[PDB]
């Protein structure tokens, strides 16, 4: 997963970045089993005035859209899931301290796509399970 | 819809900003009557030497690009429309500034989207009109 | 093409990233003919702490990702290659600069794009040959 998140300037300590991004990490280890290292977080700081929202500008909103890579989600009830699982991962840091927020997906194709160099094994595949547990790209043929 | 905007460094003032974010949600409300939030534009500085177009830096360049999500487009004459418009709004700001640049379109899932924690109403519904009306994501069943 | 290089702050110097987009540009040109002006590379310091990877900050980390407009890739032969000459000309600058990457691609639609208002020549038409000699939109 690939995960941009658009904020106000200084809106997140370091602490705050890595707990949340702890918390969409741990969205893709619980109910997918991927390998941590697959979940990528950027963290982008947006000075006032660079966010315009229905033609003003909104110095208090974090937009947040995502790349789903690894994975095709097939049902209407799994996509729901998804969105609700996210919600409850974003509330604590967002919806809880008062911004406004909103987030869309993309999914793009899976076989263009490397890490480290590699191609990522078949889902839910025993190479995939063995890079889960090293949380590294091991290479294999 | 949600727009990047990629830019060199203080091209734009904030009031360029506004009037020009101003112009891109017209395109949606004029022709559809789109809740006016759903249009969001990011403007993005870029300093010297960060864009590079064939190989050499352009430090003179805006790229665009933006993400369909509310809406698809069916077919190629409402797609030609869409890009004529986006280039009408443009003009004024970017083209006829001295700037080169170049716009594509994405189209992504309308059910992998949320805002403010809700999902949006389906389009032409009386909930989409009733949004409109208000400018705000009003909970509904 | 349209690329997105998320780097370390300060990592590359400007001569860096002219050779390394000159690089990404030759794939181009060099296999299918694009017009060179096609290919846009876009270079984001990220300072330390904004660039996660599995729940913690990894600050040694290059993340690449790009859009294919221009035309479609239709076989898993040209799409592998696609990603194993990607690799080959980002290695003297990331890989063997020690540092971690990964990269993805995806594909938007041939329709909904412009040049400096134009309309692109269809794929290996007369008119795209000439947009590729003159290195520039042609207007037709
Ligand atoms: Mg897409």
């Given at each position: 997963?690939?995960?941009?998140?658009?904020?106000?300037?200084?809106?997140?300590?370091?602490?705050?970045?890595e707990?949340?991004?702890?918390?969409?990490?741990?969205?893709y280890?619980?109910?997918?089993?991927?390998?941590?290292?697959?979940?990528?977080?950027?963290?982008?700081?947006?000075?006032?005035?660079?966010?315009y929202?229905?033609?003003?500008?909104?110095?208090?909103?974090?937009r947040?859209?995502?790349?789903?890579?690894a994975?095709?989600?097939?049902?209407?009830?799994?996509?729901?899931?998804?969105?609700?699982?996210?919600?409850?991962?974003?509330?604590?840091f967002?919806?809880?301290?008062?911004?406004?927020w909103?987030?869309?997906?993309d999914?793009?194709?899976?076989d263009?796509?490397?890490?480290?160099?590699?191609?990522?094994?078949?889902?839910?595949?025993?190479?995939?399970?063995?890079?889960?547990?090293?949380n590294?790209?091991?290479?294999?043929?």
């Open positions: 997963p690939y995960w941009e998140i658009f904020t106000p300037e200084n809106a997140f300590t370091p602490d705050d970045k707990q949340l991004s702890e918390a969409i990490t741990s969205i280890v619980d109910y997918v089993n991927l390998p941590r290292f697959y979940v990528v977080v950027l963290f982008k700081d947006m000075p006032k005035e660079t966010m929202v229905g033609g003003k500008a909104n110095n208090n909103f974090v947040i859209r995502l790349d789903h890579i994975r095709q989600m097939e049902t209407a009830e799994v996509r729901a899931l998804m969105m609700t699982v996210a919600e409850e991962k974003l509330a604590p967002i919806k809880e301290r008062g911004y406004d909103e987030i869309h997906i999914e793009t194709p899976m263009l796509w490397r890490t480290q160099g590699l191609v990522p094994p078949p889902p839910e595949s025993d190479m995939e399970k063995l890079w889960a547990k090293e590294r790209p091991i290479p294999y043929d």
